[PDB]
Amino acid sequence: LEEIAQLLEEIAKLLKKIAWLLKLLEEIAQLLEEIAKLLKKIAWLLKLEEIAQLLEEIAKLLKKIAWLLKKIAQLEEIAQLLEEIAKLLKKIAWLLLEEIAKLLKKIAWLLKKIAQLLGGLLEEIAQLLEEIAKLLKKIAWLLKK
């Protein structure tokens, strides 16, 4: 309950940093790995078992994005990976807490927009990530209540 909420607020903090770094692809990749580790902890606490499996799949997808970013420092595939994460978030919302489920679907929508922006604007993506961080912070607030 409260533990999972604290791990969500930590992810939001890491997303806000990523948005600021978008203006150092190597540093963002490291943060995405941290977010994946936090997602693994949330999955462990839940178990329940279905949502945990889906969160683990999202963690691996973020790891793939991180390895893709490290390769760029040394895009279209990242977009497809983000769309997969969105489809997984919507699946988690379908299982869930109606208010929290709606905030997840909204996060999935914004995640789809970021994927679209990757096809073409870096400033817009940073704003989208900050909106997602706010929505995650909101979900954590409902968990503590």
Numbering used by the authors: 3 to 25, 37 to 60, 75 to 101, 110 to 131, 147 to 170, 184 to 208
What does the paper say about this structure?
Here we describe efficient routes starting from validated parallel and antiparallel peptide assemblies to design two families of α-helical barrel proteins with central channels that bind small molecules. Computational designs are seeded by the sequences and structures of defined de novo oligomeric barrel-forming peptides, and adjacent helices are connected by loop building. For targets with antiparallel helices, short loops are sufficient. However, targets with parallel helices require longer connectors; namely, an outer layer of helix–turn–helix–turn–helix motifs that are packed onto the barrels.
Using the experimental apCC-Hex structure as a seed, we designed short loop sequences computationally to connect adjacent helices to generate an up-down α-meander structure. The sequences and structures were named sc-apCC-6-LLIA and sc-apCC-6-SLLA, respectively, for single-chain antiparallel coiled-coil proteins with six central helices. As the peptide assemblies were hyperthermally stable, we heat treated the cell lysate (75 °C for 10 min) and subjected the soluble fraction to immobilized metal affinity chromatography (IMAC) and size exclusion chromatography (SEC) to yield highly pure proteins in a minimal number of steps. Circular dichroism spectroscopy showed that all five proteins were α-helical and hyperthermally stable structures, and AUC confirmed that they were monomers. Moreover, DPH binding suggested that they had accessible hydrophobic channels. For the antiparallel α-helical barrel proteins, the seeds, models and experimental structures for sc-apCC-6-LLIA and sc-apCC-8 are very similar. Thus, the success rate for making these single-chain constructs from the seven antiparallel designs test was five soluble proteins (71%) and two new α-helical barrel crystal structures (29%).
